[PDB]
Amino acid sequence: LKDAQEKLELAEKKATDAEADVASLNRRIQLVEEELDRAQERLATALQKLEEAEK
Amino acid sequence: LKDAQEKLELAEKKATDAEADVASLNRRIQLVEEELDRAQERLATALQKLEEAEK
Amino acid sequence: DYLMKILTERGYSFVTTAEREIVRDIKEKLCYVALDFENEMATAASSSSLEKSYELPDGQVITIGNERFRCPETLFQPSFIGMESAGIHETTYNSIMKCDIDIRKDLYANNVMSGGTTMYPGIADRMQKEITALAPSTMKIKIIAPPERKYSVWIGGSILASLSTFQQMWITKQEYDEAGPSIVHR
Amino acid sequence: DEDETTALVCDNGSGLVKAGFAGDDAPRAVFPSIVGRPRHQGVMVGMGQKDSYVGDEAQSKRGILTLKYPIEHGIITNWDDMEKIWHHTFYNELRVAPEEHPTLLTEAPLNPKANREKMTQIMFETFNVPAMYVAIQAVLSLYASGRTTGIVLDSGDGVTHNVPIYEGYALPHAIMRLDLAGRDLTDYLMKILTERGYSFVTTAEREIVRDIKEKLCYVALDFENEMATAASSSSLEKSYELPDGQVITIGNERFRCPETLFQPSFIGMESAGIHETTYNSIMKCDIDIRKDLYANNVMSGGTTMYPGIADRMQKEITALAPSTMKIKIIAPPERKYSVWIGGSILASLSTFQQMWITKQEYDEAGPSIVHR
Amino acid sequence: DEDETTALVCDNGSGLVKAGFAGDDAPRAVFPSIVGRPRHQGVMVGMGQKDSYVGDEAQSKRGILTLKYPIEHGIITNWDDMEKIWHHTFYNELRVAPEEHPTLLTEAPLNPKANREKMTQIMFETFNVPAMYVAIQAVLSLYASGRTTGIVLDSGDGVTHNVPIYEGYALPHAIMRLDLAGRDLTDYLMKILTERGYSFVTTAEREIVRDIKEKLCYVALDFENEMATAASSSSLEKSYELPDGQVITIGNERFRCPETLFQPSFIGMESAGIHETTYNSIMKCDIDIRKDLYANNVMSGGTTMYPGIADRMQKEITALAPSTMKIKIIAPPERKYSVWIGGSILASLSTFQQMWITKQEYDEAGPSIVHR
């Protein structure tokens, strides 16, 4: 028992540190994915504007 | 004891599902951040190529 | 020959042989492949400064507004000419879902265009969007259409044959007089 | 340092080779155990005519070559093609010259005497290594988990095994082999996923079913009321995005695939399953050693990595074992390389030097020397 | 008589439907498995506006309709269009009212559980048949050749299969499916015949390449020294007269087309061929049943009708099978309807009455009842 309960406060501690880092990294991925459709979208438009001006 | 050990396979299960999802979401953020410097870089070049062709 | 009819059908006559030949020079100079060929006909109707008049061997200024793009829309819609076959973009695609699976991302990012008839401006943009919207979204589409494309074939031969490493693939009269036509046939 | 740095560890598998230097923590080289032979004459741009291809170049170019697997079910079946994989390992993968490196190799559980003598014949006589040594795979896995008595359930790409080991000696008559492993398991997922209404049509669809199996597959405990759970349809489902957009969803089958390891009947196999086999190995051993084996079920191998494999096995053998017994299923995180790591430890060890078979031993005793 | 006369047998294929009354020797109705939808608004003289066309009227009028195939590779892919083909079968082709006729239907080898339940849902709930039954196709083919254990190589218009059957139970884990059949085969002939310097330009040229394939194609044994024979140019050649005079000659290609069934490589297929697949099915089955399967290779399906198919298969598997074995390739003459005839026999049988799923069973047990 002392060993299963001790193994425990450590496994639950690790579980909460990992849930905290995943929340932070998922917030960062959504922001960089959203900076994106924006970078790439104005891109389809800038390259189209080039092919039309070059023509 | 049955209760501390049972509480356990569940807390360790949750810890491993959360470590697996953080590893996956961090791999996805690095790949979308790397698709990026690439989308934005060819962009500085496509827009520059436009201003020269328009001129 | 299809432009010919949509242009006589515009109320014209390519009667003498000096009228016939130049419909082809109209096709080359003034024809377009519009992207969103749908709301380009719609545009035609509001009648913008989309129209384009060409001066014939003589004065006879002929005007071509609209038909200008109805001609290359034949390459995506063979139905414009009583053809029941599929069109250019679908065919690009079908070729691709007939190939090995692992090579399909490669083919999709490398659609190289060559040939006199692929020179119609905006052919590449229409094809770009034609296959993006048929291909799985996980895919990268890329339609390469170089400017010299009416001679791609030739230029590729010029490069290859002037190359330093090609010398050892030339079929020589020695190979031939000794192996029969089979030799070069591979 | 002469050989402290210098000892090589090569673990030959049915699917993968794991290789590197004794001392390292993980294999420097991991690659498929294939040898491709071109179906047609021709070349890649800039290269010459190649007679043969090995590892990843054989996998990548598989459409123009006839692929062959040298190790069938852990045993070397083609010695011409194996000497090819070894050659590739030393010279291209680890880029070492073999004639100045001691080489620790691994063999399978009941590897025929004659094979251990043959790979010794090829190591010393065609590669001219200074010294070599052949360890049994389960035995290196155990040892890498610190201990010397336990029973290893070892499961990789073509074989599963149970090797009861007592104070280092693997027990020949208690070893069990079950020919169903990760290879079999990817092909079963394949069908339950096409059967979910899908198509793995091109080769870029085929290969990734295996990456679905590795990333998303589970071994549920109470696989019974997990199917039941599937039906109420919880947020148990899991969608994977393919090479392109084509988001495929896998809810349920996710665990129907590793339930194959406990129920071989899912795949038309009449053999018993992993947990029963752990147990049967154990009631085939001496009586006095059975408490030891039960508290030391060490797991190793790529296919034992499915999460919750250990909990299912824990409860699978508790409920077959006499209640007076202590059950204990050790499954370490690095287990896809246990075997290799056990070799790295052992071969870099201070006391192992006196078991290396040297060319002196060989040129004087014949292949018999290392055979033990 | 109530139902002795009254049982219907409908075999749904990828290319053709075969239908008729249990009792008859051959299908009363055979027609394409298409559903045409008019591309434009208008009418035929004397008829009204038609929303849809099925079977031969869809084929004949194909120029103004968009043709669709409900069964892709033996599996029903569109249920709106299938209920249309069934409707046509009962009401126009057999001209019966379905609500007083028991209906035996067929399904494919590993037909998804959910489909067998769906066509039961449509048979009982939209056609209101008294009773029905779904037999597996290879299983009816075998049985129509008298026996109960054997392996059927079944090959029609969109799929090829190998279904090992033991005392009536088709063996799920040993069944093989090869998606190359008579449809694929007509299109390959097409190219080797245009490649002979020809043009199948109008639709009256297209359709008849298929009638060339059926009438003049062969499966030569020793396809090797048959090409060699072609070259010495014997009176092996064969000219067919087209819809008009245009006498087309086909000497050689005549057999290059069914050599596609043994060599899928002729068509950019990387899969194994018919004979190897017969065999692989067999080394996937229990050991004790393999002598039975070998002496009972029953062939069925339109594409297995090419003369000399049986002799080539005979020698193809003798030379892969252990010599202690008896090989026996049964190919009956009516084989393009084996499946149907097996259903006619079975459903007119004296003992089958107690397996019919009745509306009583259904209204009380849900689609699950017939699903087994």
User: In angstroms, what CA-CA distances link C19 with C3, C52, C68, C81, D365?
Assistant: 13, 18, 17, 22, 99
Nearest CA in chain B to D308: B13
Is the minimum CB–CB distance between A38 and chain B shorter than 8 Å?
Answer: no
* E123: number of Cβ within 10 Å: 26
Is residue D80 within 8 Å of residue D68, measured between CB atoms?
Answer: no
Give, to the nearest 10 degrees, the angle between helix E274-282 and helix E309-318: 50
Residue with tokens 């070892």: D154
Give chain B as a 3 state SS string: CHHHHHHHHHHHHHHHHHHHHHHHHHHHHHHHHHHHHHHHHHHHHHHHHHHHHHC
D215 contacts on B by Cβ (under 8 Å): 24
Measured CA to CA, the distance from residue D348 to residue D355 in angstroms comes to 12
Say if the Cβ atoms of E173 and D268 lie within 8 Å: yes
Q: What burial class does residue D303 get, using C-beta atoms within 10 Å of its C-beta: 0-12 exposed, 13-18 middle, 19+ buried?
A: buried
How many CA atoms within 13 Å lie on the side-chain side of D284? 17
Measured CA to CA, the distance from residue E263 to residue C46 in angstroms comes to 60
Residue with tokens 């770009």: C128
Give chain D as a 3 state SS string: CCCCCCCEEEEECCCEEEEEEECECCCCEEEECCEEEECCCCCCCCCCCCCCEECHHHHHCHHHEEEECCEECCEECCHHHHHHHHHHHHHHHCCCCHHHCCEEEEECCCCCHHHHHHHHHHHHHHHCCCEEEEEEHHHHHHHHCCCCCEEEEEECCCCEEEEEEECCEECHHHCEEECCCHHHHHHHHHHHHHCCCCCCCCHHHHHHHHHHHHHHCCCCCCCHHHHHHHHHCCCCCEEEECCCCCEEEECCHHHHCCHHHHCHHHHCCCCCCHHHHHHHHHCCCCCCCHHHHHCCEEEECHHHHCCCHHHHHHHHHHCCCCCCCCCCEECCCCHHHHHHHHHHHHHHCCCCHHHCEEHHHHHHHCCHHHHC
Q: Which two tokens stand for residue D19?
A: 């290789």
Is residue E358 within 8 Å of residue E130, measured between CB atoms?
Answer: yes
Provide the shortest C-alpha distance from residue D196 to chain E (in Å).
Answer: 9
* DSSP per-residue string spanning E264-286: GGGGT--S--HHHHHHHHHTTS-
User: In angstroms, what CA-CA distances link D49 with A37, C127, D42, D259, E258?
Assistant: 46, 38, 7, 46, 35
Is the minimum CB–CB distance between C107 and chain D shorter than 8 Å?
Answer: no
Measured CA to CA, the distance from residue C30 to residue E66 in angstroms comes to 35
Q: Count B/D contacts: CB-CB distance under 8 Å.
A: 8
Is residue D210 within 8 Å of residue D181, measured between CB atoms?
Answer: no
CA-closest candidate to residue D166, choices D290, D276, D347, D277 = D290
Is the minimum CB–CB distance between D268 and chain E shorter than 8 Å?
Answer: yes
Say if the Cβ atoms of D311 and B9 lie within 8 Å: yes
Q: Which two tokens stand for residue E105?
A: 């239907």
Measured CA to CA, the distance from residue A47 to residue B42 in angstroms comes to 10
Nearest CA in chain C to D47: C165
- Give D62's contacts (C-beta < 8 A, 6+ positions apart): D36, D203
Say if the Cβ atoms of B13 and D308 lie within 8 Å: yes
Q: Which chains touch C (3 or more CB pairs under 8 A)?
A: A, D
Opening angle at CA E185, ends E183 and E189, nearest 5: 125
Say if the Cβ atoms of A53 and B50 lie within 8 Å: yes
CA-closest candidate to residue D251, choices D285, D220, D292 = D220
Structure-determination approach = cryo-EM
C139 contacts on D by Cβ (under 8 Å): 243-245
Is residue E161 within 8 Å of residue E135, measured between CB atoms?
Answer: no
DSSP 8-state code for residue E127: I
Give chain C's count of helices (H) and strands (E). Answer: 11, 4
Is residue D117 within 8 Å of residue D132, measured between CB atoms?
Answer: no
Does D touch E (3+ CB pairs < 8 Å)?
yes
Task: Please tell me which of the candidates A5, A26, A50 has its beta carbon nearest to residue B50.
Answer: A50
Say if the Cβ atoms of A55 and C122 lie within 8 Å: yes
Measured CA to CA, the distance from residue D61 to residue D32 in angstroms comes to 13
DSSP 8-state code for residue E124: I
Task: Please tell me which of the candidates C102, C137, C138 has its beta carbon nearest to residue D202.
Answer: C102
Q: Which chains touch A (3 or more CB pairs under 8 A)?
A: B, C
Interface test with B, best of A26, A37, A54 (most B CBs within 10 A): A26
Strand ranges (DSSP E) for E79-158?
Answer: 103-107, 131-136, 150-155
CA-closest candidate to residue E35, choices E21, E50, E18 = E50
Q: Which chains touch B (3 or more CB pairs under 8 A)?
A: A, D
Tell me the torsion sign for CA atoms E71, E72, E73, E79: negative
Is the minimum CB–CB distance between D48 and chain C shorter than 8 Å?
Answer: no
Say if the Cβ atoms of B24 and D215 lie within 8 Å: yes
Measured CA to CA, the distance from residue D163 to residue D108 in angstroms comes to 10
Is residue C121 within 8 Å of residue A55, measured between CB atoms?
Answer: yes
Is the minimum CB–CB distance between C102 and chain D shorter than 8 Å?
Answer: yes
User: In angstroms, what CA-CA distances link D325 with A5, B4, B8, D317, D322?
Assistant: 22, 20, 21, 10, 6
The three-state secondary structure class of C136 is coil
Provide the shortest C-alpha distance from residue A1 to chain B (in Å).
Answer: 6
Resolution (A): 35.0
Strand ranges (DSSP E) for chain E?
Answer: 8-12, 16-21, 29-32, 35-38, 53-54, 65-68, 71-72, 75-76, 103-107, 131-136, 150-155, 160-166, 169-170, 176-178, 238-241, 247-250, 297-300, 329-330, 357-358
Say if the Cβ atoms of D308 and B24 lie within 8 Å: no
Nearest CA in chain C to D64: C100
Opening angle at CA E120, ends E116 and E123, nearest 5: 140
How many CA atoms within 13 Å lie on the side-chain side of C8? 10
